[PDB]
Amino acid sequence: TRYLRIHPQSWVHQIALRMEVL
């Protein structure tokens, strides 16, 4: 269960997915 303080891998996906439209 990967969710400490900071989850740098999770944002990476939401970065693209925000990108995925125009």
UniProtKB/Swiss-Prot annotation:
Effect of Q9P: In HEMA; severe
Outcome recorded upon mutating R5P: In HEMA; severe sporadic
Reported impact of R2L: In HEMA; mild
Name this polypeptide is given: Factor VIIIa light chain
Taxonomic superkingdom: Eukaryota
Annotated consequence of substituting R5L: In HEMA; severe/moderate; may cause reduced phospholipid binding
